[PDB]
Backbone as ProteinMPNN parsed JSONL, in Angstrom:
{"seq_chain_A": "ENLYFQSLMEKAYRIKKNADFQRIYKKGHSVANRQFVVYTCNNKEIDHFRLGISVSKKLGNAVLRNKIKRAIRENFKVHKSHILAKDIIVIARQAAKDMTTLQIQNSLEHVLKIAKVF", "coords_chain_A": {"N_chain_A": [[15.788, -15.268, -18.448], [17.995, -12.336, -18.068], [18.851, -10.496, -15.032], [18.182, -7.825, -15.371], [16.094, -7.837, -17.325], [14.232, -9.565, -16.131], [13.591, -7.84, -13.979], [12.465, -5.714, -15.429], [9.909, -6.743, -16.3], [8.764, -7.484, -13.875], [8.587, -5.147, -12.376], [6.167, -4.092, -13.236], [4.262, -5.313, -11.668], [4.366, -4.17, -9.206], [3.458, -1.861, -6.687], [4.279, 1.372, -6.53], [3.707, 4.124, -6.232], [2.931, 6.623, -3.85], [0.479, 7.879, -3.991], [-1.107, 5.825, -5.004], [-1.052, 3.896, -2.926], [-2.394, 5.473, -0.971], [-4.901, 5.928, -2.202], [-5.816, 3.279, -2.199], [-5.979, 2.61, 0.482], [-8.032, 4.354, 1.193], [-10.176, 3.671, -0.488], [-10.251, 0.904, -0.776], [-11.048, -2.518, 0.239], [-10.514, -4.013, 3.441], [-8.939, -6.685, 5.317], [-7.833, -8.768, 8.104], [-5.508, -11.01, 9.659], [-3.695, -12.343, 12.482], [-1.057, -11.773, 11.82], [-0.979, -10.21, 9.486], [-2.328, -7.333, 7.82], [-4.474, -6.778, 5.074], [-5.2, -4.952, 2.194], [-7.41, -4.59, -0.548], [-8.071, -3.569, -3.932], [-9.819, -2.602, -6.83], [-8.265, -1.835, -9.929], [-8.849, 0.016, -12.585], [-7.369, 0.574, -14.794], [-5.613, -1.438, -15.168], [-5.041, -4.79, -15.814], [-4.047, -6.893, -14.307], [-2.727, -8.259, -11.266], [-1.267, -6.171, -8.685], [1.291, -5.558, -6.263], [1.846, -4.017, -3.128], [3.866, -3.364, -0.331], [4.056, -2.879, 3.182], [5.989, -2.558, 5.983], [6.243, -1.694, 9.144], [8.602, 0.425, 10.905], [8.601, -0.033, 13.614], [8.626, -2.769, 13.764], [11.09, -4.0, 14.041], [14.515, -4.754, 13.453], [16.562, -4.045, 10.507], [17.38, -6.37, 9.067], [15.298, -8.098, 9.849], [12.921, -6.85, 8.871], [13.518, -6.921, 6.072], [13.504, -9.708, 5.81], [10.815, -10.325, 6.223], [9.585, -8.836, 4.118], [10.814, -10.189, 1.938], [9.588, -12.734, 2.347], [6.955, -12.201, 1.752], [7.042, -11.314, -0.988], [8.084, -13.681, -2.096], [5.933, -15.499, -1.728], [3.996, -14.343, -3.403], [5.288, -14.81, -5.846], [5.076, -17.596, -6.042], [2.356, -17.87, -6.461], [1.734, -16.308, -8.628], [0.392, -16.892, -11.01], [-2.316, -17.238, -10.433], [-3.492, -15.164, -8.995], [-6.043, -12.839, -8.507], [-6.9, -9.984, -10.555], [-6.218, -7.474, -8.894], [-5.256, -4.487, -7.134], [-3.13, -4.779, -4.406], [-2.322, -4.396, -1.042], [-0.098, -5.44, 1.349], [0.353, -5.469, 4.736], [2.614, -5.926, 7.187], [2.194, -7.015, 10.467], [3.145, -6.553, 13.911], [3.289, -9.098, 15.084], [4.092, -10.778, 12.97], [6.77, -11.358, 13.144], [7.086, -13.385, 14.933], [6.857, -15.819, 13.733], [7.895, -18.792, 11.961], [9.628, -19.332, 8.786], [8.15, -21.111, 7.219], [5.685, -20.916, 8.576], [4.971, -18.272, 8.097], [4.452, -18.164, 5.436], [2.187, -19.793, 5.318], [0.449, -18.304, 6.828], [0.227, -15.995, 5.215], [-0.945, -17.08, 2.825], [-3.383, -17.783, 4.005], [-4.535, -15.291, 4.766], [-4.722, -14.019, 2.338], [-6.565, -15.643, 1.049], [-8.813, -15.002, 2.668], [-9.133, -12.38, 1.921], [-10.135, -12.766, -0.552], [-8.651, -12.906, -2.907], [-7.468, -14.683, -5.418]], "CA_chain_A": [[16.708, -14.216, -18.951], [18.9, -11.793, -17.068], [18.233, -9.78, -13.925], [17.615, -6.582, -15.857], [14.814, -8.078, -17.992], [13.316, -10.009, -15.079], [13.091, -6.676, -13.253], [11.58, -4.957, -16.299], [8.532, -7.235, -16.29], [8.246, -7.568, -12.514], [8.244, -3.789, -11.938], [4.775, -3.774, -13.501], [3.456, -5.919, -10.615], [4.659, -3.555, -7.919], [2.846, -0.565, -6.434], [5.351, 2.302, -6.208], [3.257, 5.499, -6.002], [2.212, 6.855, -2.61], [-0.903, 8.172, -4.351], [-1.821, 4.553, -5.151], [-1.249, 3.403, -1.565], [-3.415, 6.209, -0.258], [-6.193, 5.603, -2.813], [-6.252, 1.931, -1.837], [-6.381, 2.669, 1.885], [-9.292, 5.087, 1.306], [-11.22, 3.079, -1.307], [-10.204, -0.542, -0.833], [-11.546, -3.344, 1.333], [-9.488, -4.547, 4.313], [-9.098, -7.826, 6.232], [-6.599, -8.996, 8.859], [-5.255, -12.035, 10.647], [-2.822, -11.818, 13.524], [0.233, -11.354, 11.291], [-1.063, -9.335, 8.347], [-3.473, -6.591, 7.278], [-4.464, -6.767, 3.615], [-6.172, -4.089, 1.492], [-7.49, -4.867, -1.967], [-8.827, -2.561, -4.638], [-9.774, -2.714, -8.283], [-7.569, -0.824, -10.719], [-9.533, -0.05, -13.871], [-6.395, 0.763, -15.858], [-4.661, -2.533, -15.055], [-5.71, -6.081, -15.901], [-3.261, -7.87, -13.582], [-2.548, -7.84, -9.869], [-0.071, -5.468, -8.256], [1.52, -5.73, -4.822], [2.614, -3.072, -2.349], [4.192, -3.896, 0.979], [4.365, -1.953, 4.266], [6.48, -3.157, 7.219], [6.589, -0.564, 9.993], [9.896, 0.401, 11.578], [8.382, -0.616, 14.929], [8.682, -4.224, 13.745], [12.383, -4.42, 14.525], [15.727, -4.374, 12.752], [16.508, -4.08, 9.045], [17.401, -7.768, 8.639], [13.986, -8.707, 10.038], [12.037, -6.237, 7.891], [13.852, -7.51, 4.78], [13.071, -11.103, 5.806], [9.369, -10.315, 6.069], [9.331, -8.431, 2.738], [11.165, -11.321, 1.08], [8.638, -13.832, 2.434], [5.757, -11.806, 1.034], [7.322, -11.38, -2.414], [8.223, -15.086, -2.481], [4.604, -16.085, -1.822], [3.359, -13.872, -4.631], [5.892, -15.494, -6.978], [4.512, -18.938, -6.081], [0.961, -17.833, -6.868], [1.559, -15.264, -9.632], [-0.495, -17.289, -12.094], [-3.72, -17.354, -10.06], [-3.96, -14.04, -8.182], [-6.985, -12.011, -9.239], [-6.361, -8.689, -10.985], [-6.511, -6.417, -7.937], [-4.166, -3.866, -6.403], [-3.083, -5.447, -3.116], [-1.311, -3.935, -0.103], [0.125, -6.315, 2.477], [0.951, -4.756, 5.871], [3.058, -6.848, 8.217], [1.916, -6.644, 11.839], [4.227, -6.871, 14.845], [3.279, -10.536, 15.316], [4.69, -11.579, 11.907], [8.14, -11.7, 13.504], [7.086, -14.538, 15.815], [6.594, -17.005, 12.94], [8.944, -19.345, 11.124], [9.447, -19.051, 7.366], [7.008, -21.913, 6.799], [4.46, -20.398, 9.155], [4.564, -16.979, 7.578], [3.849, -18.466, 4.143], [0.842, -20.311, 5.522], [-0.346, -17.162, 7.274], [-0.033, -15.183, 4.037], [-1.957, -17.747, 2.033], [-4.678, -17.722, 4.669], [-5.083, -13.938, 4.742], [-5.057, -13.698, 0.966], [-7.849, -16.304, 0.814], [-9.879, -14.222, 3.306], [-9.274, -11.189, 1.106], [-10.796, -13.173, -1.799], [-7.774, -12.72, -4.048], [-7.187, -16.08, -5.742]], "C_chain_A": [[17.314, -13.438, -17.777], [18.125, -10.968, -16.045], [17.572, -8.494, -14.396], [16.229, -6.815, -16.474], [13.793, -8.686, -17.033], [12.741, -8.798, -14.354], [12.2, -5.799, -14.118], [10.141, -5.432, -16.154], [7.952, -7.163, -14.883], [7.908, -6.211, -11.927], [6.779, -3.485, -12.206], [3.829, -4.296, -12.401], [3.716, -5.319, -9.262], [3.987, -2.187, -7.851], [3.907, 0.332, -5.807], [4.855, 3.662, -5.737], [2.542, 5.614, -4.653], [0.752, 7.188, -2.881], [-1.718, 6.894, -4.479], [-2.082, 3.917, -3.788], [-2.405, 4.133, -0.898], [-4.798, 5.992, -0.869], [-6.706, 4.25, -2.317], [-6.69, 1.89, -0.389], [-7.75, 3.334, 2.024], [-10.442, 4.321, 0.65], [-11.288, 1.56, -1.24], [-10.93, -1.19, 0.317], [-10.365, -3.917, 2.117], [-9.93, -5.798, 5.07], [-7.803, -7.957, 7.037], [-6.636, -10.295, 9.646], [-4.189, -11.481, 11.602], [-1.517, -11.263, 12.953], [0.15, -10.303, 10.185], [-2.389, -8.609, 8.248], [-3.366, -6.603, 5.759], [-5.556, -5.848, 3.099], [-6.222, -4.559, 0.054], [-8.359, -3.834, -2.653], [-8.729, -2.804, -6.127], [-8.982, -1.554, -8.859], [-8.108, -0.983, -12.14], [-8.564, 0.06, -15.035], [-5.509, -0.452, -16.059], [-5.436, -3.834, -14.991], [-4.907, -7.215, -15.276], [-3.083, -7.354, -12.165], [-1.275, -6.998, -9.725], [0.052, -5.613, -6.75], [2.318, -4.562, -4.263], [2.743, -3.642, -0.952], [4.528, -2.759, 1.93], [4.79, -2.807, 5.455], [6.933, -1.966, 8.057], [8.002, -0.716, 10.551], [9.777, -0.165, 12.989], [8.609, -2.121, 14.94], [10.022, -4.746, 14.239], [13.482, -3.931, 13.596], [15.6, -4.6, 11.243], [16.517, -5.512, 8.517], [16.017, -8.387, 8.754], [12.996, -8.178, 9.014], [12.249, -6.828, 6.501], [13.421, -8.971, 4.698], [11.582, -11.191, 5.555], [8.979, -9.911, 4.649], [9.655, -9.56, 1.77], [10.09, -12.403, 1.144], [7.357, -13.471, 1.698], [5.967, -11.92, -0.474], [7.423, -12.825, -2.881], [6.858, -15.744, -2.657], [3.871, -15.617, -3.07], [3.995, -14.475, -5.881], [5.299, -16.888, -7.15], [3.113, -18.939, -6.67], [0.685, -16.818, -7.963], [0.448, -15.625, -10.606], [-1.969, -17.225, -11.72], [-4.145, -16.321, -9.023], [-4.882, -13.192, -9.051], [-6.381, -10.636, -9.517], [-6.874, -7.592, -10.061], [-5.201, -5.765, -7.496], [-4.266, -4.331, -4.952], [-1.98, -4.814, -2.267], [-1.277, -4.915, 1.079], [0.899, -5.509, 3.517], [1.325, -5.814, 6.874], [2.769, -6.226, 9.575], [3.072, -7.115, 12.7], [4.396, -8.376, 14.999], [3.839, -11.363, 14.162], [6.085, -12.071, 12.274], [8.194, -12.977, 14.333], [6.876, -15.849, 15.065], [7.851, -17.485, 12.252], [8.662, -19.017, 9.657], [8.286, -19.85, 6.795], [5.705, -21.32, 7.315], [4.026, -19.13, 8.46], [3.976, -17.16, 6.184], [2.432, -18.949, 4.313], [-0.071, -19.184, 5.962], [-0.722, -16.254, 6.117], [-1.09, -15.796, 3.132], [-3.321, -17.656, 2.684], [-5.314, -16.338, 4.504], [-5.5, -13.574, 3.329], [-6.307, -14.438, 0.507], [-9.001, -15.525, 1.444], [-10.18, -12.992, 2.482], [-9.895, -11.493, -0.237], [-9.969, -12.841, -3.026], [-7.103, -14.061, -4.3], [-8.344, -16.607, -6.598]], "O_chain_A": [[17.161, -13.838, -16.623], [16.917, -10.767, -16.169], [16.521, -8.11, -13.883], [15.292, -6.072, -16.181], [12.608, -8.36, -17.111], [11.532, -8.73, -14.133], [11.261, -5.192, -13.602], [9.244, -4.623, -15.911], [6.782, -6.821, -14.71], [7.032, -6.117, -11.066], [6.186, -2.69, -11.477], [2.726, -3.776, -12.231], [3.324, -5.901, -8.25], [3.952, -1.449, -8.836], [4.373, 0.082, -4.695], [5.517, 4.301, -4.919], [1.661, 4.813, -4.341], [-0.122, 6.824, -2.095], [-2.891, 6.87, -4.107], [-3.189, 3.452, -3.517], [-3.294, 3.503, -0.325], [-5.778, 5.88, -0.132], [-7.897, 4.098, -2.047], [-7.663, 1.214, -0.054], [-8.547, 2.932, 2.872], [-11.558, 4.318, 1.169], [-12.307, 0.982, -1.621], [-11.374, -0.522, 1.251], [-9.338, -4.264, 1.534], [-11.1, -5.963, 5.417], [-6.795, -7.337, 6.7], [-7.661, -10.647, 10.23], [-3.83, -10.305, 11.536], [-0.926, -10.364, 13.551], [1.116, -9.572, 9.966], [-3.443, -9.172, 8.546], [-2.272, -6.452, 5.217], [-6.708, -5.952, 3.519], [-5.185, -4.897, -0.518], [-9.276, -3.281, -2.044], [-7.668, -3.173, -6.632], [-9.024, -0.437, -8.344], [-7.855, -1.987, -12.806], [-8.904, -0.322, -16.155], [-4.734, -0.501, -17.014], [-6.376, -3.968, -14.208], [-5.063, -8.372, -15.666], [-3.262, -6.167, -11.895], [-0.344, -7.1, -10.524], [-0.944, -5.769, -6.045], [3.331, -4.158, -4.834], [1.842, -4.318, -0.454], [5.194, -1.795, 1.552], [4.041, -3.682, 5.891], [7.909, -1.301, 7.708], [8.531, -1.822, 10.658], [10.743, -0.719, 13.513], [8.77, -2.706, 16.011], [10.08, -5.838, 14.805], [13.397, -2.843, 13.025], [14.669, -5.251, 10.769], [15.745, -5.841, 7.616], [15.594, -9.122, 7.862], [12.305, -8.957, 8.358], [11.287, -7.196, 5.826], [13.015, -9.432, 3.632], [11.127, -12.025, 4.772], [8.136, -10.563, 4.033], [8.861, -9.858, 0.877], [9.709, -12.945, 0.106], [6.733, -14.337, 1.084], [5.166, -12.548, -1.165], [6.905, -13.168, -3.944], [6.643, -16.469, -3.629], [3.196, -16.41, -3.726], [3.308, -14.641, -6.889], [5.045, -17.32, -8.275], [2.718, -19.91, -7.315], [-0.474, -16.489, -8.215], [-0.349, -14.768, -10.987], [-2.812, -17.163, -12.615], [-5.066, -16.575, -8.247], [-4.547, -12.865, -10.19], [-5.477, -10.183, -8.815], [-7.824, -6.879, -10.383], [-4.155, -6.414, -7.486], [-5.336, -4.286, -4.345], [-0.838, -4.705, -2.712], [-2.297, -5.178, 1.716], [1.953, -4.942, 3.227], [0.457, -6.533, 7.368], [3.062, -5.053, 9.805], [3.873, -7.956, 12.291], [5.521, -8.875, 15.04], [4.052, -12.562, 14.343], [6.531, -13.098, 11.763], [9.254, -13.597, 14.427], [6.73, -16.896, 15.697], [8.765, -16.704, 11.987], [7.599, -18.494, 9.323], [7.52, -19.337, 5.98], [4.727, -21.23, 6.573], [2.831, -18.922, 8.248], [3.097, -16.398, 5.783], [1.553, -18.565, 3.542], [-1.223, -19.105, 5.535], [-1.859, -15.79, 6.037], [-2.026, -15.114, 2.715], [-4.321, -17.471, 1.992], [-6.487, -16.227, 4.147], [-6.511, -12.901, 3.132], [-7.044, -13.928, -0.337], [-10.059, -15.393, 0.829], [-11.338, -12.595, 2.35], [-10.163, -10.569, -1.005], [-10.524, -12.527, -4.079], [-6.28, -14.519, -3.508], [-8.336, -17.771, -6.999]]}, "name": "protein", "num_of_chains": 1, "seq": "ENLYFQSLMEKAYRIKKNADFQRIYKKGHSVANRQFVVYTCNNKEIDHFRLGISVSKKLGNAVLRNKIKRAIRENFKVHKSHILAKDIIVIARQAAKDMTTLQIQNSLEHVLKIAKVF"}
């Protein structure tokens, strides 16, 4: 269906509130590979995963930041059906910029396996 209704459903899988980010940083578990830090945390009110993304401004220019965000969202679309019901924050590290599009997907899958979400 259309872009409006796609966005209706997909908004539920996104973490928007700064309060949620900060709760997850304080209460969640963290792991990291060279390209990504990942925090995960249970949300008792929610029975499906949610994703929040952080790409620092230090990483580079807007085109690059948007490329990294896109690659993360794309990976979660590929695996939507089998991500455990956790709130998840993905933080791109400086080194994510040094990877190709294929590499960054593999790196994401690896880190998310370490984080035990799957």
